[PDB]
Amino acid sequence: TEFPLGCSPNVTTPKNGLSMELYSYDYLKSGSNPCWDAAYLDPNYPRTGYKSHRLLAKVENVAGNINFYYHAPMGCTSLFDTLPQAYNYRTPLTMTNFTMLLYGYFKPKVTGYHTFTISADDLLFVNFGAGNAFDCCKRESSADDFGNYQAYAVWGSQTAKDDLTVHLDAGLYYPIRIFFNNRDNDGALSLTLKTESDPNPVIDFSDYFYSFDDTKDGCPGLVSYD
């Protein structure tokens, strides 16, 4: 979808950053082959399956540069380390093996074409736009109903890097959902943004990520171009 639907929350001062949920991604029993759990590849793991793992935390105000590379000292071993500052989560977690969901709204600074580019170890699935990610100011009631991924990247496959080129309006806030998994060993997440305006990729999303409370009537976007 080249013209994704946006939202018009018309809230006085919007809340900065996305919401995050972290969940466990345990290795298989210590004599299993391979050592890692393959659930991350089942089609419903990003929808229902992650909820069968342990909730590690629900965090708010995730904003900044969310990109990271984590080098595991060794493979098939659950090891602890920390996420970047932007994630608002300071305590060590199993960086070798975990699940992470981010959701909220993306607001453009300038109207025009935006190319989001992603790469991941092991997995990054992105939904973007109302309906596709979730409904405007109706996130809780549409949370699990996200459609086809607007970008997807899986380590070791024939689509390990992906992009999404969309025409966006600076007036609107766009529902976004980002689902990440590290099954084992190294972990990495790269999201960048390229517009027809700037000369280089944007990697710091501080002024771009927002959160909005759900409302009874919702907040459909009030910019349309048919």
Ligand X SMILES: CC(=O)N[C@@H]1[C@@H](O[C@@H]2O[C@H](CO)[C@H](O)[C@H](O)[C@H]2O)[C@H](O)[C@@H](CO)O[C@H]1O
**Positions in the binding site for Ca ion (CB under 5 A):** 121-122, 182, 185-186
| 63-71, 145-153, 179-187, 198-206 -> range binding ligand X (CB under 6 A) | 179-187
User: Known binder of ligand: residue 184?
Assistant: yes
Check whether 121 is labelled as a binding-site residue.
Answer: yes
Smallest distance from the beta carbon of 32 to Ca ion, in angstroms?
16
Distances, alpha carbon 20 to alpha carbons 15, 35, 77, 107, 206, in Å? 14, 27, 25, 18, 15
User: Rounded to the nearest whole angstrom, what is the least distance from the CB of residue 187 to ligand X in the complex?
Assistant: 7
Tokens linked to 101: 């969901």
Verify binding: residue 37, ligand X, rule CB under 6 A.
no
Nearer of residues 61 and 182 to Ca ion, judged by Cβ: 182
By CB under 6 A, the residues from 102 to 161 that bind ligand X are: 121-122, 155
**Rounded-to-integer distance, Cα 139 and Cα 81, Å:** 31
Our separate counts of H helices and E strands in the chain read 1, 14
Shortest Cβ 123–ligand X spacing (Å): 9
**Residue 122, annotated as binding a ligand:** yes
In this structure, what DSSP letter does residue 216 have? S
Question: Within 13 Å of residue 46, how many CA atoms lie on the same side as its CB?
Answer: 23
185 is an annotated ligand-binding site residue? no
- Min CB(156)–Ca ion separation in Å: 9
Quote the CA–CA distance of 113 and 202 in Å, as a whole number. 14
By CB under 6 A, the residues from 183 to 212 that bind ligand X are 183-186
- Structure-token match 């959701």, residue found: 103
Helix, strand, coil shares of the chain, percent, nearest 5, are 5, 40, 55
Q: Is 76 in the site for ligand X (CB under 6 A)?
A: yes
Instruction: Provide φ and ψ at 140, rounded to 5°.
Output: -60, -45
- Distance in Å, CB of 117 to Ca ion, minimum: 19
Omega before 122 within 30 of 0, i.e. cis: yes
Nearer to Ca ion, 121 or 169 (CB): 121
Look at residue 75 and give the partner it binds from Ca ion, ligand X, none, a contact being a CB closer than 5 to 8 Å depending on partner kind.
ligand X
The label of the residue with tokens 């970047």 reads: 84
List interacting residues with ligand X (CB under 6 A): 36, 75-76, 121-122, 155, 183-186
Residues flagged as binding site:
121-122, 182, 184, 186
Binding-site annotation, residues for Ca(2+): 121-122, 182, 184, 186
